[PDB]
Design a protein around this ligand. Structure first.
Ligand SMILES: CC[C@]1(C)O[C@@H]1CC/C(C)=C/CC/C(C)=C/C(=O)OC
Length: 221
């Protein structure tokens, strides 16, 4: 029992089912293919700066805490058109290796990246209801669409040496938020990190719905 079954529409039951689920799955369940979500590690993620093609940010081994305590802020399940809209509020703390490539100059900056913010992640997915060969009914959750509805106000830190290197390159005594690469680090990088998190989040729902009878998610249908 990793699932508490809920009546359709009871946000109270859903909220404590969500709490249960994230705790039970926080450090992963490899026999069910459930990825660890808190702490969630992201091997590798690149982001280009939307407003500068010559800045490549490469993240390695990001350590992300705070997903096991996400709160449902919107749930819209249409049992006719067979769709789900889920939105959650998460308090994220993110730490990891960062590589900043200024390709146009053939320069590079290695270091440690830190981010704290609250995000709101929005996922939309279709599903079907379908039986096993053993004759047990399962949800099949189709590939989801993700929106980074809110990135909050991120608090970004870089390593002390990484900072001094950029201060020496740019020519300013401080790191500059109205400029590159902090602008990308505050925004798009956050939007992308949040997407990686909700990919794992939605995969775990998918993965668990392969194993568990659909009646373990909702009682009537
Ligand atoms: C396959 C099930 C279904 C149709 O997609 C609907 C279930 C969505 C939710 C919130 C169920 C409550 C328990 C879970 C797993 C919460 C969760 O993982 O939050 C991130």
């Amino acid at each position: 029992a990793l699932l508490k079954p809920c009546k359709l529409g009871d946000m109270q039951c859903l909220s404590s089912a969500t709490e249960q689920f994230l705790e039970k799955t926080s450090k992963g369940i490899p026999q069910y293919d459930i990825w660890p979500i808190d702490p969630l590690v992201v091997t590798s993620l690149d982001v280009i700066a939307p407003s500068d093609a010559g800045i490549v940010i490469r993240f390695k081994n990001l350590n992300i805490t705070g997903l096991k305590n996400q709160q449902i802020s919107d749930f819209q399940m249409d049992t006719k058109a067979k769709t789900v809209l889920l939105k959650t509020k998460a308090d994220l703390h993110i730490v990891g290796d960062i590589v900043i490539e200024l390709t146009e100059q053939s320069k590079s900056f290695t270091g440690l990246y830190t981010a704290d913010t609250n995000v709101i992640g929005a996922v939309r997915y279709g599903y079907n209801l379908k039986n096993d060969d053993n004759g047990v009914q399962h949800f099949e959750v189709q590939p989801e669409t993700f929106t980074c509805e809110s990135i909050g106000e991120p608090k970004i830190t870089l390593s002390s040496d990484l900072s001094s290197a950029l201060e020496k390159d740019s020519g300013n005594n401080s790191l500059e938020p109205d400029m590159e690469p902090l602008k990308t680090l505050r925004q798009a990088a956050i939007c992308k990190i949040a997407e990686a998190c909700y990919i794992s989040v939605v995969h775990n729902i998918r993965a668990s719905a392969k194993i568990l009878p659909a009646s373990s998610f909702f009682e009537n249908l």
